[PDB]
Design a protein around this ligand. Structure first.
Ligand code: HEC
Ligand code: HEC
Ligand code: HEC
Ligand code: HEC
Length: 118
């Protein structure tokens, strides 16, 4: 496969639950633009980390059997890798933070600078 263009936006999967704000319903975050061209220095298989096992096809992260929970992140399941908050935050934030600490060009680490669309 080829990487999509830079107009690509990552959204929560259909059915995604948001944590309640007290006893009121939560809201999902704004969606996340993701430009592949700005990550052209990172091997595809770094992020698409099952690419070999998947026969070289790129599967969505939230594919059944992968990070396919629709549950929001709470105390109980905080370390469950199947949750979408955990899968994407671990991938996206951790690298941007590490690079910012080595004083390198990097991407957003603040909530509102990643979750920008909506
Ligand atoms: C992390 C820094 C990434 C690198 C490097 C590459 N990709 Fe990527 N890609 C990444 C994410 C988080 C997503 C969203 C997937 C999701 O399920 O949310 C994508 C998306 C794609 C897709 C589209 C999948 C779809 O919408 O069906 C393709 C085809 C794709 N990526 C291919 C691809 C290639 C070939 C890469 C190397 C050149 C590559 N990606 C790098 C994250 C990252
Ligand atoms: C199924 C075939 C998956 C695809 C597609 C994606 N992920 Fe995944 N991921 C999957 C499993 C079964 C696991 C457990 C560990 C393992 O290697 O078997 C993971 C792990 C992660 C992690 C944690 C990595 C670590 O701690 O070393 C992250 C951050 C992660 N996965 C993110 C992630 C992203 C963003 C994906 C789309 C680009 C993605 N994975 C696809 C299963 C599958
Ligand atoms: C390293 C392994 C990274 C991972 C994983 C992710 N990002 Fe990234 N990002 C990285 C670099 C080195 C840069 C700078 C690119 C440059 O040459 O300037 C970026 C940049 C971004 C940007 C653009 C910010 C801007 O143009 O000002 C975005 C929007 C971004 N990154 C988002 C993003 C997402 C959503 C990620 C997980 C799917 C992700 N990055 C992973 C390095 C790495
Ligand atoms: C990119 C570098 C991000 C940063 C910084 C933050 N978030 Fe994020 N988050 C990111 C992606 C790619 C995703 C999956 C796509 C989506 O929009 O769901 C997420 C997901 C979440 C979620 C789960 C889904 C939702 O409820 O909308 C939450 C609750 C969440 N993100 C919150 C959040 C907070 C509070 C942040 C700052 C501390 C934050 N995100 C930063 C990518 C990135």
């Amino acid at each position: 496969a080829d990487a999509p263009g830079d107009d690509y936006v990552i959204s929560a999967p259909e059915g995604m639950k948001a944590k309640p704000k007290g006893d009121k319903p939560g809201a999902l975050q704004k969606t996340v633009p993701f430009p592949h061209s700005k990550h052209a220095t990172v091997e595809c298989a770094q992020c698409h980390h099952t690419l070999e096992a998947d026969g070289g096809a790129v599967k969505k992260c939230t594919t059944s059997g992968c990070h396919d929970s629709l549950e929001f992140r709470d105390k109980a399941n905080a370390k469950d890798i199947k949750l979408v908050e955990n899968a994407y935050h671990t991938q996206c934030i951790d690298c941007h933070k590490a690079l910012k600490k080595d004083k390198k060009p990097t991407g957003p680490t603040a909530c509102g600078k990643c979750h920008t669309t909506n």
